[PDB]
Amino acid sequence: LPILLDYWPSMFGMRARVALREKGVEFEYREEDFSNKSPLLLQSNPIHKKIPVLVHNGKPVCESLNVVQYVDEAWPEKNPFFPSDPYGRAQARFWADFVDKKFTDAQFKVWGKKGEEQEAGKKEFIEAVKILESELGDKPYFGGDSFGYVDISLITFSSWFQAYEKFGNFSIESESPKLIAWAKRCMEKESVSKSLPDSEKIVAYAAEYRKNNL
């Protein structure tokens, strides 16, 4: 079995958990202790020392977007994350760079800070959520006719939506029900219904992460 060494509150890791589970692969999960890095994670990636990495055939695949595409290409037989045409997977990648970059800095700061930034990213979060809202036109997913590449990227941001519901004190649904409820569709599937941890717990992670560093 390929083993996922991961971080239970990590969206990025959940992307990997979602990918493997979307497929149908039996894989082993590993809990990482960031203070006490395992010898296997250290030996897979002694540089950034970052999750998730999948060792399959005795070879480690690091970083979330990179893992999910490794998941797709190493097993490309049933439910494909990419479309068949170059410009199609293109859009999925373009929006994958979108989700992991500007959308992520917006949320990282929504759950991660107080004062000015938090408000400045109240705006940034809403406006980015707005542009995905625009781009989707009206797609039940993102990257293809079923569960896909950027759907994978952002679905794990949907566990954190309740954390962005409170510290951002938003309703990301009352301004744009389209996106959360895109996830709530995506939630009926077991890839996210078995890989995504409790949201009351995600709201807890960020709340306690707020206690420990000021």
Partner 1 sequence: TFDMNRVIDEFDEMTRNAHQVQKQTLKEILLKNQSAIYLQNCGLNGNATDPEEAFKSMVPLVTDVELEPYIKRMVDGDTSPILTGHPVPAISLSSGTSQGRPKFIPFTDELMENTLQLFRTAFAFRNRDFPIDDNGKALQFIFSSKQYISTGGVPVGTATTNVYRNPNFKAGMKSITSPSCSPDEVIFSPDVHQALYCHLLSGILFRDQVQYVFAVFAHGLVHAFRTFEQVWEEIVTDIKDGVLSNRITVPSVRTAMSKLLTPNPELAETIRTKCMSLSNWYGLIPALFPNAKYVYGIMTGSMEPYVPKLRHYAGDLPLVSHDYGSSEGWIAANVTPRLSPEEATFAVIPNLGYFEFLPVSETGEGEEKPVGLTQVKIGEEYEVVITNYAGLYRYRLGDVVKVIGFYNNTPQLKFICRRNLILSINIDKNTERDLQLSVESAAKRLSEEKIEVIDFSSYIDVSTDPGHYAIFWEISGETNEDVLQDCCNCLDRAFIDAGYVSSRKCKTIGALELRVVAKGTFRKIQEHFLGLGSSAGQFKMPRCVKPSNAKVLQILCENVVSSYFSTAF
Ligand X SMILES: N[C@@H](CCC(=O)N[C@@H](CS)C(=O)NCC(=O)O)C(=O)O
Q: Give yes or no for a contact between 209 and 16, defined as CB atoms under 8 angstroms apart.
A: no
Closest-by-Cβ residue to ligand X is 12
Tokens coding 102? 């500007």
Q: Is residue 178 a contact partner of residue 83, using CB atoms and an 8 Å limit?
A: no
DSSP string, 50-77: -S-EEEETTEEEESHHHHHHHHHHHS-S
When CB distances are held under 5 to 8 angstroms depending on the partner's kind, the choice from ligand X, partner 1, a second copy, none that residue 165 binds is none
Following DSSP, what letter does each residue of 75-90 receive, concatenated? Answer: S-SSS-SS-SSHHHHH
Decide: is 44 part of the binding site for ligand X (CB under 6 A).
no
Binding segment toward partner 1, per CB under 8 A, in 8-16, 81-89, 118-126, 158-166: 81-89
Q: Which residues contact 196 (CB under 8 A, 6 or more apart)?
A: 14, 17, 18, 155, 156, 158, 159, 187
- Taking CB within 5 to 8 Å according to partner kind, which of ligand X, partner 1, a second copy, none is near residue 34? ligand X
Q: What does the longest C-alpha to C-alpha distance in the chain come to? A: 49
Compute the least distance from the CB of residue 102 to a second copy, in Å.
8
Q: Is 150 among the residues that bind ligand X (CB under 6 A)?
A: no
Residue 157 in contact with partner 1, rule: CB under 8 A: no
Query: Considering the rule CB under 8 A, would residue 68 count as an interface residue with partner 1?
Result: no
Q: In the complex with ligand X, which residue's Cβ is closer, 12 or 147? A: 12
Would you tell me which residues interact with ligand X (CB under 6 A)?
A: 7, 10, 12, 34, 49-52, 63-64
Binding residues for glutathione: 10, 51, 64
